[PDB]
């Protein structure tokens, strides 16, 4: 999100220039309104994705789920913030990129902080582990995790004795895949270019706008 100042940008602290600028009219108020609309829309965009359940559920204290291991994805309380290990790698990889220019240009802060967003994803994870799809349609109804997995196996068209007869093998495969995700993400060729390009585009656009001030336009 960003914001602009008509006068401080166009007329640099020059009161005669500021007086003369009044002739042109409503141009920069138009620009201000457009930018304000964008800024509000950003916070709405963040709200829609994550704020899907009112009720904030909590992680169970006992961590036995029939052999399925989720410690990689669940929040880790020891480290000061409740960020899961994978969220830690993500927040260390993306953030290679509130500036010295301030020629009338600021960068406003987001409305929801990262602690709040982490709380929301934790609520969804806890609800999903304990109850199945039920918590997004009504009140949460607990169910054992292997029975939930059998339900899903029926969903995709394989009978449910198969899960109960290969429970251990299935759990091992799932744990191994979760383990490998960390390394696949730690692979140097950045798969996070999608989120790096946003910061790159914004920084470069601001630099171009600022550098434009040292031009004469044929004067």
């Amino acid at each position: 999100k960003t914001s602009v100042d008509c006068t401080m940008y166009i007329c640099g602290d020059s009161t005669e220039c500021s007086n003369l600028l009044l002739q042109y009219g409503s141009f920069c108020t138009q620009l201000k309104r457009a930018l304000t609309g964008i800024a509000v829309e950003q916070d709405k965009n963040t709200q829609e994705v994550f704020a899907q359940v009112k009720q904030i559920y909590k992680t169970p204290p006992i961590k036995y789920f029939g052999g399925f291991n989720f410690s990689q994805i669940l929040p880790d309380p020891s480290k000061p913030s409740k960020r899961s290990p994978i969220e830690d790698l993500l927040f260390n990889k993306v953030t290679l990129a509130c500036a010295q220019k301030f020629k009338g240009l600021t960068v406003l802060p987001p409305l929801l902080t990262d602690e709040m967003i982490a709380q929301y994803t934790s609520a969804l994870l806890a609800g999903t582990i304990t109850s199945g799809w039920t918590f997004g349609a009504g009140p949460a109804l607990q169910i054992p995790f292997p029975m939930q997995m059998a339900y899903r196996f029926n969903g995709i068209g394989v009978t449910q004795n198969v899960l109960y007869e290969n429970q251990k093998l299935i759990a091992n495969q799932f744990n191994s895949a979760i383990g490998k995700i960390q390394d696949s993400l730690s692979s140097t060729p950045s798969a996070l270019g999608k989120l790096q390009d946003v910061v790159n585009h914004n920084a470069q656009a601001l630099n171009t706008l600022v550098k434009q001030l040292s031009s004469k336009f044929g004067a």
């Binding site: 100042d5 401080m8 602290d13 009112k54 802060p109 109804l141 054992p144």
Partner: protein, 132 residues
């Protein structure tokens, strides 16, 4: 530069009252009377820039509303998890949002919960289709 140009004003609505609050983006409480040059400003502007209701936020310095402890849903955003609202004699308060109610459901090895009744509900959805 000479002076910081614009501020942000929080109003409940001229319908309701005439109190406000002012937000000084990007500055810090102790030097707010400076960099606004509060001395040359008229009175009724010097009432802000100092006082007893002075608050520091990640977004800036907020003067004119006090900080309660309990939480409510957002009414007027200010930034960094801080909202504000007009509420009980009558004044403007500023708090932290509440993300939602608190809950925790019981997971056990061999327990299952099953509904025994139903309700039917009707909801609406408004969408635009065209413009002038």
């Amino acid at each position: 530069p000479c002076s910081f140009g614009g501020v942000s004003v929080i109003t409940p609505g001229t319908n309701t009252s005439n109190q406000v609050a002012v937000l000084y983006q990007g500055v810090n409480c102790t030097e707010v009377p400076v960099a606004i040059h509060a001395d040359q400003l008229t009175p009724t502007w010097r009432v802000y820039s100092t006082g007893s209701n002075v608050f520091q936020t990640r977004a800036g310095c907020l003067i004119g509303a006090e900080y309660v402890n309990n939480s409510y849903e957002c009414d007027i955003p200010i930034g960094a998890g801080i909202c504000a609202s007009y509420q009980t004699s009558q004044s403007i308060i500023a708090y932290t949002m509440s993300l939602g109610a608190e809950n925790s459901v019981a997971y056990s090895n061999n327990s299952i919960a099953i509904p025994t009744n139903f309700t039917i509900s009707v909801t609406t959805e408004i969408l635009p289709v065209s413009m002038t």
